[PDB]
């Protein structure tokens, strides 16, 4: 560990790799803490699906989300257990208890918000899932000249999409995928177009999916190293920051205040640029902790000195959620090309069909695995090969269905995994709706309560805003209801519901971008820099300001490379 | 990867790194073969509790629990749903779905035994209690002569000791400890003996436990290196061991066939010496899969060729388990040394103690504790400080009360974690029986369904023997429920009850240990040697051949430490 | 027709669910695994609690019950009666 | 008749509930039979039934009726959670 930096980075996931892969690229010397460690295998920041074995019991995997999921705020319990036994030690009030939070009303919550301290960060377990936003959820990059916006939008996701490796082609052969599919695209019959969800992965083979992460961004490797021996780079694990100090003027930042948990000691760190990507809550926390926006509950009474807007017009996304149970009429088209003969299990039984035939519904592929999945399992009552991979389908939002959609099998189950109804047959669907930014709906910081560690703990205020945002919300539900009986009709115990408010992580807008702080009330420009300071610079999906209903992660990793840009075009890196 | 080593392992849990130890250390060139991969952080192999996030959110550890471990015989399943919509694909019959086993009888099962694959297996999340058998549970390494046979025990349970890092004071200054230990200690004064779970731990700080695992018996790095310059090991991760070779003669082992499940080539590896440690459940399993045993449904009209005995006789322990909420007299006393005045929450609130005072019922490390939690916590109820450690209490197995015990708070938890009541008032209780060794209880692997790795499907036919087995379960459930209420009445969602059949994991002698594979109805000697090969060894829990109610790791790795003897002077390492 | 009933009308699926007795019962086959090693234990899924060994569980009523009382099902209907028109009537 | 533990969360004042009720085509194979050894509690032939929803309009009109209650009750309020929409048992 040295004193002095070029460019210091609080966070290793997907956000933070891009300002290293950006900068420690163009030569600067970069330090990148993180208050978790190294917990994906020998690939730091990889994603945690990236198993064998998890690929062939994925519904093991929610395991693992939940294992780092650490729930933001806590109201305090007020069950009420009357059956304990006399002897035992019994409460008189309701009092905290648990680590939970007395500043938080219950009922103006997002219960389901919630934070993954590991190297990588979220991006060791998230879906991948990674659509561009139309301009209707995009903030603006370019005022007045709208094909400017457009192609500045173009360049920075057409890179966030390399970073990441985004495509839509890693389920092309899987029957369920092109059942689904090929149902809502005749169905719809022009009215909505559906592709591939776009996924940050690549296929190795037909059962295993390289999942990307904030390791495909960036490696996290020390450097200088053999493969890139005139770069600079160390990442420092299990290490706390707590504070950027402010000169007098407010006009720079002078240093990083860190906590290094294993030995408990304590340093500040010098750097000429201070990038915080701690995501979208802890770069909030961060920032209140040292004397931006405001300390404790809300008091218009006592504006803050500095950045009003920080922690205020912040959004979370509804989602609504069920399952379905394959029509019969789908499963018997998933075989509409075959002559099948005789009693399956018996030495009579065949199923063929005639390869490249004009009036085939499918393809010579499909109906090969359809004819040795009913050939070899004469057992199996299904069409559908077994390891046939899940549907991964979406109807990107648009204005008459202002929504975003995930149709196929996703890893974060809700309840227990029911195992009556043949998993083949079941088709999930998730639907997120865009929130308005309303200044009312708040992320703030106790002045007496504090977090496991030790920074003031974080409380919401915050109602899915009327008019808009909650008719929609309940079109989406009926959208949903409608789309999905096109399918099959809902399992028991996945019926049509609202998620937990914040389940869904996609916050935004807790440190708003904007062109003018007052007349955007926003907390950092179009560079990502706050607004009086030189060198500090804010990345992450706090930035967003706009109502979107599209997965915010390559928007934020776009606005990130844009944030590289001007501080290549501002700082010089030192000499190596 | 080379086509020839000395020694290969197959599986790099604790029992194969003990293999590692003693042979990388004596000089062999060894190879080592898991089927699962490194996931764990830089330390290969090691716990993954010891994370400053799991040891402040331990709530959350039972995530990474129950996402790697995945049920060994699930039988087909019967549940009726017929809330489906008609539209919906419906089943006809209890069809095979979702992985199921149609060998397996629902009622004669283990239900809740299952299987690990990561590197470091199931150490890198075990709860690292470390007891040393008993004669009465433990088979004789020497017969006709009980001194020298607990002499031999002594010398081979110290080296395994040694290896884990087993201790009994890392929770010596623990209230929560103290408080129950003390409690049950008077209680049950001149009757029964209580004293700290031995554990593999060391404590590193008054809230952290740097908990052992295969990655402290061997740190599983690649040799040659710096620390290690003549040495030789290569661990292989992602690598399904799937047969040893015969000869003709069944008099050795020729090679071990492997399936690189991420390249999907297949391989023939030779060594001089093969030893199994995949666990009990696939140690078993790959035996038969290579022509030991008998493969299929059990039909002792077509007596096997090799090793009769493979999967008969195998033991699996009762559980009983409860938590409980601490008494009102036990939490009254934690302060009873205190002095108090002036009013909480004010500046006139003073706690304190008098140092040494005779009449002081606690120690001054427990009243400094107290006190100062008091004091920075006024608002408080109760008087146990925040992160006070868990207890870890146990009186050990005796013949008064046949059963191994656990109380205090385990990681595995076994509903949803309830939040109404304060933590530091619940304590858990675990009660583990012994199982009586029958031929009759079997694991067998189907001749025709395969597993998610194409290999035989494992079986259970077991039942609780009825007798001394059955007599002492329900026995062993009293006395639960008899000694918890010394402390506390039950917490409600947490009552009484037995646990499913091999949620504990303690499965035994699936490939049992003895004298004389016909008179003690056997796999393996006392070399843990395979009668009638020369050079093929196993280690693990399913040598054990009694009926055992203590923790089983430390036993088998005891015996695997003598197998390396053998091995040590009767196979020479190859040149350098 | 009580004013306690209707007072209380949360309470009255009670006086439904009371004499609503099921048609057909399929043969249980659900697993309990953790009875104690002492207690009495099935080797099959036999014929328990009036079940009938006759009925196939995945094509069956379910739901359907009847109501052995004076005044049959009209002592806790909802008295919904709508006439059916020309589609619905023989 | 309410169908599981009445929440008592949100003010009854605002709950409706929404019950669908389709129309099942007379099919041959579809019976209500009674066994010739088994019996019931008052020693009569034990009633079985072989029964399922016939494919076809039945079952389009049974699934179209579910859509149908999620469009025309979502312009009251939306669902309350624990009675979300649902077949009941048959
Ligand atoms: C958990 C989850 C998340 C997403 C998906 C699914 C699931 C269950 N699916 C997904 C999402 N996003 C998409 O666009 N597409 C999808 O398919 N998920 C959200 C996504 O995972 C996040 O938006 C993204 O990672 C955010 O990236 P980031 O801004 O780099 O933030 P992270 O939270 O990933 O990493 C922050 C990093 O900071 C460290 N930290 C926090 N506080 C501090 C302090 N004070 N000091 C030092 N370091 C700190 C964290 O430990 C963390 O690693
Ligand atoms: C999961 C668990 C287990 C234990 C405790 C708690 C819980 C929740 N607590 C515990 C236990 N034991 C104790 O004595 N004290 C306690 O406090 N647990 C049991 C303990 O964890 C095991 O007894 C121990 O690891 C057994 O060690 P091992 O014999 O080395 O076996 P493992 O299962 O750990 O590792 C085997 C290893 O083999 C790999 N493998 C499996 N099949 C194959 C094939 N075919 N090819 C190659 N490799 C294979 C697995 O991947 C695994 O890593
Ligand atoms: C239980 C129920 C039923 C209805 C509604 C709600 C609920 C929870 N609501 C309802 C109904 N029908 C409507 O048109 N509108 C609604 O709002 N329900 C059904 C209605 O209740 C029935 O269709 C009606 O009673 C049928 O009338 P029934 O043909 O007279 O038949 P019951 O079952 O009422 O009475 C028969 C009667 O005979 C006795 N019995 C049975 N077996 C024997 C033998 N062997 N010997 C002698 N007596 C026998 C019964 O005890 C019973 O009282
Ligand atoms: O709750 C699950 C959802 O979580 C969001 O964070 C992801 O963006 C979605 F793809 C989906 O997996
Ligand atoms: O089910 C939890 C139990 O699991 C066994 O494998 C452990 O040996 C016990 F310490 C206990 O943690």
Redesign the interface.
């Known amino acids: 560990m040295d004193i002095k930096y070029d460019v210091v980075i609080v966070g290793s996931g997907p956000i933070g790799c891009t300002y290293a892969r950006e900068l420690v690229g163009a030569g600067y010397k970069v330090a990148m803490f993180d208050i ?7 690939k730091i920041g990889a994603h ?1 699906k990236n ?3 998890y690929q ?2 994925i519904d ?2 929610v ?2 989300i ?3 999921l ?1 729930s933001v705020s ?1 109201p305090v ?1 007020t ?3 009357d ?11 309701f ?4 680590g ?1 939070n007395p500043e938080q009303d219950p009922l103006r919550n997002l219960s389901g918000q919630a934070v993954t ?2 190297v990588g960060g979220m991006s060791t377990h998230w879906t991948c899932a990674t659509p561009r936003f139309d301009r209707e959820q995009r903030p603006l990059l370019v005022k007045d000249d709208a094909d400017a916006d457009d192609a500045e939008w173009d360049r920075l996701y057409t890179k966030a999409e390399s970073y990441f490796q985004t495509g839509t082609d890693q389920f092309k052969e899987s029957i369920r995928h092109n059942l689904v599919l090929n149902k809502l695209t005749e169905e719809y019959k022009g009215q909505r177009d559906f592709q591939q969800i776009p996924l940050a992965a690549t296929r ?2 037909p059962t295993f999916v390289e999942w990307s992460s904030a390791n495909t961004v960036f490696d996290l490797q020390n450097r200088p190293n053999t493969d890139a021996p005139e770069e600079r780079f160390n990442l420092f694990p ?1 290490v706390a920051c707590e504070r950027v100090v402010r000169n007098a003027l407010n006009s720079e930042i002078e240093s990083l205040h860190i906590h290094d ?2 030995s408990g000691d304590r340093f500040e760190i010098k750097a000429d640029v201070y990038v915080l990507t701690a995501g979208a809550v802890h770069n909030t926390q961060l920032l209140v902790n040292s004397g931006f926006g405001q300390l404790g509950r809300p008091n218009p009474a006592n504006p803050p000195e500095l950045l009003p807007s920080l922690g205020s017009y912040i959004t979370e996304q509804s989602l609504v959620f069920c399952q ?8 018997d088209s998933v075989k509409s090309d075959m002559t099948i003969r005789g009693t399956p299990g018996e030495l009579t039984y065949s199923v063929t069909y005639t390869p490249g035939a004009s009036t085939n519904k499918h393809p010579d592929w499909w109906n090969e695995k359809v004819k040795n999945h009913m050939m070899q399992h004469q ?4 069409p559908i090969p077994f390891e046939d991979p899940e549907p991964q389908v979406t109807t990107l939002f648009q204005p008459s269905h202002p929504w975003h959609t995930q149709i196929g099998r996703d890893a974060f189950s809700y309840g227990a995994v029911q ?5 083949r ?1 079941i088709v999930d669907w998730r639907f997120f709706g865009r929130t308005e930014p309303k200044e009312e709906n708040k992320l703030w910081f106790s002045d007496k309560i504090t977090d ?2 030790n920074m003031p703990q974080p409380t919401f205020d915050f109602r899915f805003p009327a008019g808009r945002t909650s008719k929609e919300a ?2 989406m ?2 959208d949903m ?2 789309m999905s ?1 096109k399918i ?5 115990g996945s ?4 998620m937990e408010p914040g389940l869904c992580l996609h916050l935004g807008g807790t440190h708003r971008m904007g062109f003018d702080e007052k007349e955007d009330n926003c907390c950092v420009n179009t560079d990502s820099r706050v607004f009086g300071f030189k060198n500090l610079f804010l990345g992450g999906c706090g930035n967003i300001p706009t109502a979107y209903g599209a997965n915010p992660t390559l928007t934020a990793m776009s606005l990130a490379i844009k944030s590289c840009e001007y501080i290549k075009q501002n700082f010089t890196p030192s000499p190596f």
């Open positions: 978790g460690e190294i917990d994906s295998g020998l945690k198993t064998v074995e062939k019991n093991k995997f395991n693992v939940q294992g780092q650490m806590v319990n069950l009420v257990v059956t304990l036994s006399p002897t035992s030690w019994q409460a008189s009030t009092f905290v208890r648990n939970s301290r590991v190795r083979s299990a948990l294993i379905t149970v394959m029509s019969t009429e789908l499963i057992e199996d009552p299904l195992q009556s109804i043949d998993s047959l496991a560690y309940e079109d539900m009926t209801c409608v009986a099959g009709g809902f399992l028991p019926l049509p519901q609202f």
